[PDB]
Structures are given as C-alpha cells and as structure tokens.
Write a protein that binds this ligand. Structure first.
Ligand SMILES: [C][C][C][C][C][C][C][C]C(=O)O[C]([C]OC(=O)[C][C][C][C][C][C][C])[C]OP([O])(=O)O[C][C]N([C])([C])[C]
Ligand SMILES: *[C@@H]1O[C@H](CO)[C@@H](O)[C@H](O)[C@H]1NC(C)=O
Ligand SMILES: *[C@@H]1O[C@H](CO)[C@@H](O)[C@H](O)[C@H]1NC(C)=O
Ligand SMILES: *[C@@H]1O[C@H](CO)[C@@H](O)[C@H](O)[C@H]1NC(C)=O
Lengths: 129, 694, 188
C-alpha cells in the first residue's frame, strides 16, 4: 500500500476517533448540566485538524507524474514529461503523442483492413513461418 | 393513543380516612358500610369488601355523623335544623325516599361490647372465645401496636379487622392475615419535590485511545453483532431516569406526617416520618442544596428535618419567638433565609432561622376582605396600602403572575407585523363578587404601587354559590364563573394584554438604557382584548402547566365537580378571534389562526382519569411539575385522593413513538438494495456491450 | 430541547433512500435511454458532408474552394424531476410526521418556520428547530458531490441547395497564405 490509501485509512480512523470523542464530550455537557439542575477541547480540536490535514494530503498524494512505455521499442525507457495533468494546447498534446512512436489518426493512416489482408497473406511466406 | 398506557402511567391512590363507624350489610355478608372522615358539614360514606381491600364506592354526604342512623337496613339521614331527610338503600346507594316533614324513625348505632362476648386478651395475645364452653379457638399473637377491634364476624365467612396502629387496619380470616390498609394520607396540605438522577497532550491521546480501544475490544464479541449495531433492543427504568420522569414527591398531611411517594412504580411508599406537630401548615426547602426541610406547625413550632436516602431524622424542634396559632408562611428571598409568618389574629412576624446548615422587598397578602401589600425594610414589616371591599362585596378569587422564561418577545401576525405582548412582572388579578347589584368585577392590580389599570364588570345574574376561579398566565388572564342569562352554563372569560394594539408599535418599553423605576409609577400601561366562552360542566378549580422551558402551549387544566380532570390548550381560548367567516383569505391574521368558536364542547380524549372515580375532596390542589423531554409535563391532584399523570399539550415530538414501523422501513431499504444489486449486471452487460457493437 | 436518539432512524434511512433512488434513476435512464433504405442514409450523409464543408472543411481548402462547389451543386441539384421528488415527499410525510429532528446551525427567517415545522402545532418554538422534511430539503441540493464520488456519469434538398448557392463566395478563408507569419509569430 502506497501513501494515498495509507493516508485514507489513517484519516478515516483518526476522524472517526475524534468524532466519537467529541460525541462523548458534548453529550456529557448537557447531561452533566442537567444533573446539576441546569448548572477536552484543545486536544480534541488538534486531533480533528490533524485528521483533516491527513485527508487533504491523502487527496493530493493520489496524483502521480505521467510515465509511459514506447509503442515501438521493447526496453523500458520511461518517457516522462514530469507533469501531473494533460496540456490543452494542441501543440503539446500532439507532442506527447509524438514522443511515443504512435500516430493518433491511426486507421486513416494505416488503412488497417487492406494492409491486413496483404500482410497476412505475406506472413505465410517469411522465415518465422 | 390511550389504551396502551391507560392504567400504566396513572397513579391513583384511594384514601378512606380513619374509620368512625363500621355497619354490617344484611345481604352479601362479606360487605360493610364505613362512615368516616367527619367534618363540620359532611362525612364520607363508603362501601367496603371486608375479605379484601377494594373499596366499592364512596359518597360525600352533607350530614354530620351523629345525624346518620339506621331504620327500625335503610340508613336514614335526617337534618336537625330543618327536617329534610333522605332514606338511602344499603347494598346500592339508591335514594329510596326523600322528605321534608317527618323522619320515619331512627335507632342509635350500638356500641361494640366485644369484650364479654367473643374476645379475651391476657398475655400480649388475643384469644377468640365461644360465648359458652369457652374453648378459646383461633388465638393470635397481638401486633406491636394495638388500639381496638374494629369489626368481627363469627359465622361462616369469618373476618376480623384490627385497628392496629393509630391509622393502620389489618384484616384476618379463618387465623391468617388477608389484607392490610393504611389511611395516613387522608389530607395533603403542602408538597415538595425531590429529584433522583445518575451519580502532556500526548498522554491524553494515549489514555483516550487505550480506554476507547479496550472498551471496543471488551464488547467486540457477543448475530449479536447486528443487534448491538441496531441499538433498538430494554429496561424502562433507565429511560425514565434519563428523562426526569422518575421523582420522589414529599407530602405533608393534615396531621403530622411526612412521606415520600415514588412518582413511578405506582406510588410505593419509600419512607414515612411521623411528626408530633398535631397539624402541619407549610413545608419548604431550607437551601438550594435540596437536603433539608423546614416544617411549620399550627400551634407555632418549627421543625428542621434532614432528608436522606434512608428514613429521615427530625434533627431539630423548637418554638417560634411568639407562641400563637400560625395562619400562613411566605418564603422571602432565597439567599437571606427569611420567612414572613402570618398568625391568626393577623399578626406578622419576620423570621430568620439559620444559614441552613435601595433594595426594597415587597410582599402581598390577600383576604376575603381585600388585598393589602407590605414592605420589608430594616428587618421590619410596614403596611403600605390597602384595597378593601365594601360591606356587601367579597373577594372570591386571586392570582399572582408566575415567573416564566421568556422565549419570544411578541406575537407575530400574517404580513409579518408583531404586537409586542405586555410583559410587566409585578401584576396580580382578582375577582370581586357584589350583591346589591349582582355583578362580578375583574381587576388587574399593580402590586408595587396599587394602581388598578383595568376594571371589567359582568351583570348576567351570576350565582355566587357555584365555584369561581382565576389563573394568571405569562401575559393573559383566564377566569371562570357560573351564570344564567345567556344560557345557564359555566362560563370562561379570557383577557390578553398587549403594549399597543396597532400592529407594529412599542409605545413604551424603551429597552436600550432606561432602567425603569416602578415605585414612582412611570411604567407603561396596558391595552387588552377580551372574549367569553361557554362550558358545559361546573369547574371546581384551575391551573396552568409548567415545563423546563416555557415553549409548549400552557394547557389550562381544570378539575370539575365530578372529580374528572380535563385540560384545554391556550390556543383554543383565543382572544382576537373571528367567527371563521372573516378568517378566510384574511392575510393579516396569523400563521394557523384559530377561529373564535364560543361554545367549547368537552372532548373525551382529553379527559384524564379515563375511568377513575377520584373523589378529590372539598379542599384540593392541582399542581404541575416540569420534566425534561419538554413535550411532557406531570400534573398531580392532591387532596383526599392523591393522583398523578403526564400530559403532552402539543403532542409528543421529542420522544419519537411507541408505535414506530421499523420493519417496514428496513423492508423498503432491503428491497431497494436487492433490486439495485440484481438490475446492475443486466444494464451493465447489455448496454455497454451492445452500444459499442464489439 | 432534548431530543432522544431518533437521529439515526431518520437521518440514515433518508440518506440511504436518496442515494439508492438516485442510482436506480441513473440505471433506468440508461436502459430506457430517455432511414431503412440505403438511399435515406446516403442523402443524410451527403447533407452532413455539405454541413461540414460549410463549417469544417471550408477553412484550409484554399486552392480547392472553387473546384468543390460544382460537384456539390450538381450532386445535390420534466418527468425525471416530477416522479421521484414527489414520491420521496410522499414517503417522508407518511413515515416521518410530527417530530423534531434537529436544529440547523444557521438562523432562518420565520416563513421557514412556517414551511419546515409542519409536524408541530406550537407557536413560539424557534425558527432553527426543524421537522424531518427539512433534511430532505437540504439533501436534494447537496447530494451532487456524493453522487460524483460514489461514481456516476452522464423539402430537404431545396434548403441546402440554397445554402450551397449562398456559400460560393461568402468566405474564402485566409489560410495556407498567412501560416508562415503565424509560425514565425511563435516558436521563438
Ligand atoms: C439559505 C442559506 C442560509 C443563510 C442564512 C444566513 C446565515 C448567516 C447569518 O446567520 O446572518 C444572520 C441571518 O439573519 C437572517 O435570517 C437575515 C438574512 C440576511 C441575509 C439575506 C440575504 C438576501 C444575520 O446577521 P446578524 O449579524 O444580524 O445576526 C446575529 C449574529 N449571528 C448570530 C448570526 C452570528
Ligand atoms: C369480595 O372479595 C371476595 C374475595 O376476593 C369475593 O369473593 C367477593 O365476590 C367480593 N365481593 C364482591 C361484591 O365482589
Ligand atoms: C340543615 O339545614 C340547615 C339550613 O340552614 C343548614 O344550615 C345545616 O347545615 C343543615 N345540616 C347539616 C348537617 O348540614
Ligand atoms: C404501629 O407502631 C409500630 C411500632 O412502632 C410499628 O410497627 C408501626 O408503626 C405500627 N404497627 C404496625 C404493625 O405497622
């Protein structure tokens, strides 16, 4: 388990514990007031904010930098942009496409069916067959 | 809504008084007639099953005991001033005959003579003898106390009644004890309520985590897991103790007797203390701590009693400074521990008892002659003013303004304008009944200075022989009297007080920094609106209910002549009402503006004492005790018969229900869960695999 | 006031029912979803081709603008809202009536006391104390983030011939002529 799910589970446990402790403390401020005939803040607060900050850091450490594998090659060669999101300018989007050896137009470029029939008739002849 | 808790919550005790005469019944041989509870004008004639308890019926006859004698049976009762007489059947209270000229006859009820006939007591032991051949069958050891043998029947349904202590009666049969009765509670004068209830930072983190986790671990086992999660499945004692329903009611009888009654468990007696004061007049808590009582006696003594969980102890008895008969006692300011004592002969004594181990004070006394008022200065009392009635007038009803928690400062109208109800604390209301004009006048006196500020007279031939009463609310007054002219029926009248009747005005009550001075007389004066309603039955007395915060409607509660108790919410008694023709599409009226409806019919749902007889005596008190669970308030009737119950004027909205449908809700949730879980694969597979046509 | 452990049996079932009926609504709208001759789809296709050559392909066809038009002209010539909210109001007013459920943390005005406290017949209780229906009145507005987090998602020839005659010289787009300036306007 990496940091994000760890921080989710820890945040859930801490927040439930702080909620139960505040339930107990605020229940015996009215019951105890009634027992007197109508007559633990700091640590609880700090625990609650600790749980909140844990949750926020658990929501933020769920973002991993994008890392790829090349379509053509077979070694690892992780092609990392060092980004968290995807660019909106078409230049950089097609850039991150081109660093991988693929083409998003795909079928229009390769025309898969015709070269498919030609190559699968070809593949019988070659040496690996 | 009633039948679940019909007899469960109602708390009625039957008191027959100390028995004066026990007359056998000629038919149904195990039955007797008991004349008891004498007074100057009436007595209590009851029927009693002698082989059990189980009082059969009771009636308050308006004759003294010496005027009630048998025939020459038929129980002839004859007045002495006139010769009005009534012959009543035994074994059924049928008025067999009535007349004015001559009584048929009488025989004096015979004395017991049970010695020389059937009884001999020598060695602290009671022997029953045959008249002849005194073989002494059925001997019995005497009880600790022993006064006399009340009743004794020797034939086949053998029954014996012993008056064991001064107020206790023991009943034996052929000898084994069969029943036991106690009438120590025959007349309650004053009450008091006793309540029963429960009972660096990293180290804080560790102790809290360890105790919580160990608490979870211990309860982890004992499926039972789902029922522990349910929290539905129960003992009602913790529920009653949590809401404040359970209480101890401390009552002082007319003779000297303090006792504690369990407000739950149908009034089992927790403890009884016997004083020797020979009459009790008042009872107070000595301090806010609610541990000690001070008890005033008729002859002038005062007692200090230590209330404990066990039987109390009478820690002190001593006389007052002046040994005269005590009429009444007023509690002065709590912290100064003062009391003002009014002796008959009308003499006032300031009293400062103990620590319990210009700031003027004003008092107000009322008599049938008028309202008097006093000022307490420098530990002395001084007469301040007087409002005395004429020779032919007589004050009949009087009431003070009860202190009330302030929730809302004004009643708000439709179109969101507010009337700014009149809230001035030092007010009293009273009724003057005048012969020589046959009128009833209502007055709303300002008690610090003595201004009248309202007078309102009715001339509709009031009767003056039927009971009259008044109650004073937060900002309204309601009084009741009988009258003949419109129809011969009981009548209620309600007046409501406002600072000004124009829909948005504070003509006065400048609240910023003014620091009002009431003794000068500078205060603002009220305006009022009044209505009258007709009620079927004669209302003996009235009260208004109390809660922890005075939010729910006040529920004017009435004790009728029958003994039945009925309340009506203050919403029904609406001044400013309209006849329900002018309420339609009147945007200005209110939220949920109730109509006028002058004729009020009796509603059998609200009649508390569903089937209880509840003969409450001539001198009785209606009291209301607040509780938690603010929808509910306790009401009790003290007198000859002591009774207690709970009412909810606005419905029960705090506690959810005893008839909640949990199973239907869980069935709905489970149906939704399974239908989702079954329809999900169908939609997923079908639509996702068909829309892409793979 | 002092309410007594009716928070669970009112707050939790209502929220569960709203979540489950939202999921069911999504699934039912998925399943319900809210030309046959080849010539019909062919003509629709040619109509769409005219539309895209108006909008889509009429931008970078600088040399080919003139050649196309002859070929073109010669070839051419709320139950979803109403059902479930009413059902839920019906169910809530049936099962949960005449109760005080909670107090809101923010002070409303008195007409909200009129709207929200239908169960109770008091007259000065508060504006901040509410019956059960208020919990629905908030849960309708605020359930969007929960739904997001749990995972959920959302005759003919004459007219186009007239536009074909309209589009002849309407706009010949200045593209494939200024592109050197814009390439030299960036990538510096
Ligand atoms: C529907 C969402 C809920 C919004 C409710 C408003 C919450 C904010 C709020 O309490 O302000 C209140 C709302 O008093 C009022 O009720 C008057 C409303 C004023 C805003 C009207 C907007 C056109 C008015 O401010 P205040 O200083 O006069 O009240 C005393 C201070 N306080 C106790 C409030 C801390
Ligand atoms: C009196 O009590 C006895 C025993 O409980 C019973 O047999 C008898 O019927 C009772 N009397 C009446 C009138 O019910
Ligand atoms: C008998 O009648 C007179 C009539 O004035 C009344 O005063 C008296 O009280 C009556 N007797 C009893 C015992 O009440
Ligand atoms: C009468 O007094 C005795 C002795 O104090 C006590 O038992 C009780 O108060 C009375 N007797 C009985 C048998 O109850």
């Amino acid at each position: 388990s990496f940091v994000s799910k760890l921080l989710y589970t820890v945040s859930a446990l801490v927040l439930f514990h702080s909620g139960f402790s505040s339930y107990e403390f605020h229940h015996l401020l009215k019951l105890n007031s009634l027992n007197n005939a109508q007559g633990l803040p700091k640590d609880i607060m700090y625990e609650t904010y600790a749980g909140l900050i844990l949750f926020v850091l658990a929501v933020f450490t769920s973002f991993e930098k994008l890392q790829y594998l090349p379509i053509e090659s077979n070694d690892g060669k992780i092609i990392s942009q060092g980004n968290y999101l995807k660019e909106i300018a078409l230049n950089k989007a097609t850039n991150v496409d081109n660093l991988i050896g693929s083409n998003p137009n795909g079928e229009i470029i390769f025309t898969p069916s015709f070269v498919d029939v030609h190559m699968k008739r070809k593949i019988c002849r070659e040496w690996a067959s | 809504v009633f039948s679940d808790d019909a007899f469960i919550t109602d708390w009625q005790l039957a008191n027959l008084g100390p028995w004066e005469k026990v007359i056998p019944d000629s038919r149904d041989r195990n039955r007797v007639l008991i004349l008891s509870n004498p007074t100057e004008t009436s007595c209590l004639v009851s029927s009693f099953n002698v082989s059990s308890g189980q009082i059969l019926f009771r009636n308050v006859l308006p004759f003294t005991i010496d005027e009630i004698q048998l025939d020459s049976n038929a129980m002839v009762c004859v007045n002495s001033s006139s010769n009005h007489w009534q012959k009543y059947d035994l074994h059924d209270w049928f008025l067999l005959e009535e007349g004015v000229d001559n009584a048929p006859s009488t025989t004096i009820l015979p004395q017991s003579s049970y010695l020389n006939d059937q009884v001999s007591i020598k060695n602290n032991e009671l022997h029953i003898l045959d008249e002849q051949s005194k073989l002494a069958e059925w001997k019995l050891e005497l009880p600790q106390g022993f006064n006399k043998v009340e009743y004794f029947h020797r034939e086949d349904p053998l029954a014996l009644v012993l008056n064991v202590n001064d107020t206790q009666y023991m009943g034996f049969s052929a000898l084994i004890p069969v029943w036991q009765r106690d009438e120590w509670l025959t007349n309650v004068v004053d009450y008091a309520v006793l309540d029963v209830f429960d009972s660096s930072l990293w180290n804080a983190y560790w102790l809290r985590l360890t105790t919580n986790w160990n608490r979870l671990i211990n309860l982890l086992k004992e499926p039972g897991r789902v029922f522990t999660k349910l929290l539905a499945l129960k003992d009602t004692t913790v529920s009653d103790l949590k809401f404040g329903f359970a209480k101890i009611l401390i009552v002082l009888t007319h003779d000297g007797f303090i006792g504690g009654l369990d407000m739950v468990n149908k009034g089992q007696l927790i403890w009884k203390l016997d004083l020797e004061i020979d009459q009790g007049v008042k009872m107070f808590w000595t301090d806010k701590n609610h541990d000690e009582l001070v008890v005033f006696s008729h002859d002038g003594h005062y007692l200090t009693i230590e209330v404990t969980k066990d039987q109390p102890i009478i820690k002190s008895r001593s006389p007052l400074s002046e040994r005269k008969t005590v009429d009444s006692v007023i509690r002065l300011n709590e912290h100064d521990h003062q009391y003002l004592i009014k002796f008959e002969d009308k003499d006032h004594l300031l009293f400062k008892l103990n620590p319990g181990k210009s700031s003027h004070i004003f008092v107000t006394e009322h008599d049938t002659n008028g309202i008097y008022g006093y000022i307490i200065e420098n530990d002395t009392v001084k007469q301040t003013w007087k409002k005395a009635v004429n020779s032919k007038e007589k004050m009949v009803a009087y009431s003070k303004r009860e202190t009330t928690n302030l929730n809302t400062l004004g009643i708000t109208l439709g179109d969101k304008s507010v009337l700014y109800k009149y809230l001035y604390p030092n007010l009293a209301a009273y009724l003057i009944a005048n012969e020589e004009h046959h009128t009833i006048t209502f007055n709303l006196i300002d008690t610090i200075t003595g201004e009248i500020l309202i007078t309102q007279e009715h001339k509709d031939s009031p009767d003056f022989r039927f009971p009259m009463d008044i109650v004073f609310g937060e900002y309204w007054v309601v009084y009741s009297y009988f009258s003949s002219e419109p129809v011969p029926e009981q009548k209620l009248v309600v007046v409501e007080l406002y600072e000004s009747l124009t829909p948005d005005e504070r003509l006065s009550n400048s609240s910023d920094n003014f620091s009002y001075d009431p003794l000068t007389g500078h205060i603002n004066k009220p305006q009022f609106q009044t209505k009258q309603f007709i009620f079927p039955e004669i209302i003996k007395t009235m009260s208004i209910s109390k809660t922890t915060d005075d939010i729910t409607t006040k529920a004017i509660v009435m004790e009728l002549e029958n003994g039945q108790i009925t309340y009506i919410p203050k919403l029904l008694l609406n001044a400013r009402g309209k006849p329900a023709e002018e309420m339609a599409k009147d945007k200005k009226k209110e939220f949920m503006a109730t109509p006028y409806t002058p004729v009020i019919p009796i509603n059998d749902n609200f009649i508390i004492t569903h089937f209880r007889n509840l003969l409450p005596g001539s001198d009785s008190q209606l009291i209301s005790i607040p509780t938690n669970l603010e929808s509910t308030s306790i009401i009790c009737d003290l007198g000859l018969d002591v009774f207690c119950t709970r009412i909810t004027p606005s419905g029960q909205f705090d506690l959810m229900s005893p008839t909640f449908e949990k199973g239907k809700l869980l069935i709905t949730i489970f149906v939704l869960l399974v239908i989702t879980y079954f329809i999900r694969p169908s939609v997923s597979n079908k639509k996702l695999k068909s829309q892409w046509l793979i | 006031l002092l309410d007594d452990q009716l928070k669970y049996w009112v707050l939790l079932p209502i929220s569960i029912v709203m979540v489950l009926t939202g999921v069911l609504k999504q699934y039912i709208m998925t399943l319900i979803t809210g030309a046959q001759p080849r010539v019909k789809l062919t003509e629709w296709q040619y109509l769409q081709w005219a539309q895209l050559l108006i909008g889509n392909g009429g931008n970078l066809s600088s040399d080919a603008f003139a050649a196309k038009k002859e070929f073109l002209v010669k070839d051419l010539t709320n139950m979803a809202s109403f059902i479930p909210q009413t059902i839920i109001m019906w169910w809530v007013n049936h099962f949960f009536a005449g109760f005080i459920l909670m107090q809101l943390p923010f002070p409303l005005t008195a007409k909200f006391k009129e709207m929200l406290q239908t169960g109770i017949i008091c007259q000065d209780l508060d504006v901040r104390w509410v019956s059960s229906i208020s919990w629905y009145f908030i849960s309708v507005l605020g359930l969007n983030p929960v739904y997001n987090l749990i995972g959920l998602n959302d005759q003919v020839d004459k007219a186009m011939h007239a536009m074909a005659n309209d589009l002849t010289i309407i706009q010949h787009e200045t593209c494939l002529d200024n592109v050197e300036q814009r390439v030299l306007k960036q990538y510096m």
